[PDB]
Amino acid sequence: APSRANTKVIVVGGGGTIGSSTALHLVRSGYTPSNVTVLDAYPIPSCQSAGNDLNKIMDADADPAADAARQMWNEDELFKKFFHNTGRLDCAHGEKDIADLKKRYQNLVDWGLDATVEWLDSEDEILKRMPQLTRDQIKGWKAIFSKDGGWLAAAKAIKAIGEYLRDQGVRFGFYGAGSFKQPLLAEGVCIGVETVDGTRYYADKVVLAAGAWSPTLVELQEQCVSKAWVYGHIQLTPEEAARYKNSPVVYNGDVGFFFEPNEHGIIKVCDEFPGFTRFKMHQPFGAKAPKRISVPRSHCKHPTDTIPDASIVRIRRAIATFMPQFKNKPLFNQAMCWCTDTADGHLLICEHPEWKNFYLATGDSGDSFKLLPIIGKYVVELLEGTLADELAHKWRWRPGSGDALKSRREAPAKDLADMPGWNHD
Ligand SMILES: *Cc1cc2c(cc1C)nc1c(=O)[nH]c(=O)nc-1n2C[C@H](O)[C@H](O)[C@H](O)COP(=O)(O)OP(=O)(O)OC[C@H]1O[C@@H](n2cnc3c(N)ncnc32)[C@H](O)[C@@H]1O
């Protein structure tokens, strides 16, 4: 077995979140960069990566991995400039949701010494934090304001990792040269990969970090089920955008959520719902015949696609609620953004059970962008046999462990076949 410095690694989906983090940690840990090969369907930051976004939410999760990531977002010189510590305002209306919000302000006294949070008990209190909100729209609302957290400039952070890797001498292959087709196997050991154009790459270890594409590329036995979420954007004038500078992330689980305008004056608005599948017949490597599997419908591959009409209605309601003064702005650059759910919502980070030296690093479950800085550390630990037992178990190979179509969400995802308005072919 080669020394670390002579060990060759291929990261499939290295243009995305987990895959770029993995490449970075291989470099940071003392792998020789020219021994590391990033393969992606699209150049880093991949156009179709779920991390290719103006913004994501950084919450205040107590989990050890999330806390390790939060520290890096605050202190790591590669990542720090992309974390915007604006705070988050979580709003609720009606006795059911206000009951759950109250409960939750008590999970935080209990679980993680509060004082990093405020209860807001009236319209007046919320308006003091977020004065751009409309009083009559928030009649009867309560909120929790969390001081830590905020948002992450997601595309820029992956792009910064790519620039770092390029400058270190990491090898890249994109498009036909980067699109995984199959592993190369010799006597049950993975010795590299082949891409759709027939290019072969040989390495000691292969990481499959293909996000929502992972269950399309190899047979995962429904451990992961791929689903899309949706957003649109509105353009503010400089004067309008100035009013929202450093605004918290604003969220109401019955409505949706929105972010501070970017440096171009654009606000992204998002729905809140259990995701959409797009089932069709497909044959991953290792499947003996085609199967009905949820296969991403990639906005990058089909840039005339939008989102479902149902999704537009929901986003419009979010704008009518949160920003009634902007109800006439067109919602543009509507897109679907793919992730893959496990049954329990934990990652799938494990060696393949039959293909030695092939490792899965997926199962993102819609909440892993905030792990970008840290997650490749764990992947490297997996490759090196040093991953903590609890995590090796939590992230294990586990077909038959529950229905990922519902996962731990409120309902089984609906399918795009049944949701008109996104396909303009
Ligand atoms: C879609 C979404 C996700 C999301 C979010 C809102 C939306 C609409 N809000 C979040 C938030 O507020 N906070 C948070 O922490 N996360 C949030 N997310 C989730 C997050 O985006 C995802 O969990 C995470 O980014 C997933 O990362 P992963 O690395 O698993 O997936 P990826 O970034 O999409 O990268 C996969 C890459 O694989 C490449 N690919 C695909 N096919 C191939 C082949 N054949 N060969 C090689 N590479 C391939 C893709 O191109 C992509 O780069």
Residue numbers in the entry: 2 to 426
From the paper:
Fructosyl peptide oxidases (FPOX) are deglycating enzymes that find application as key enzymatic components in diabetes monitoring devices. The inability of wild type FPOXs to act on intact proteins is the most critical issue limiting both their diabetes detection efficiency and their protein deglycation potential.
In the present study, we set out to enhance the thermal stability of the L3-35A mutant by implementing a methodological approach whereby different thermal stabilization strategies are tested in parallel and their efficiency compared. These various strategies involved mutations to either improve the RMSF of the protein (generating mutants hereafter referred to as D-series mutants), increase the number of salt bridges (C-series mutants) or form disulfide bonds (X-series mutants). Our MD-based ranking led to the selection of six candidate mutants (C16, D02, X01, X02A, X04, and X07) for experimental production and characterization. On the other hand, the introduction of extensive surface charges and salt bridges (mutant C16) resulted in a further increase in Tm of ≈ 1.5 °C (Tm = 55.2 °C). Finally, the incorporation of a single disulfide bond in different positions on the L3-35A scaffold led to a significant improvement in thermal stability of all the tested mutants of this series: X01 (54.1 °C), X02 (60.0 °C), X04 (55.2 °C) and X07 (55.3 °C). Based on our thermostability results, we selected the X02A variant for its high Tm, high expression yield, and detectable activity toward glycated amino acids and we set out to increase its activity toward larger substrates (i.e., fVH and F6P). In this process, while the amino acids that are directly involved in the catalytic function were not modified, some tunnel-lining residues were replaced. This could explain the reduced activity of both the L3-35A enzyme previously reported and its thermally-stabilized mutants described so far (D02, C16, X01, X02A, X04, X07). Hence, we set out to design mutations to enhance the catalytic activity of X02A, the most thermally-stable mutant of our library.
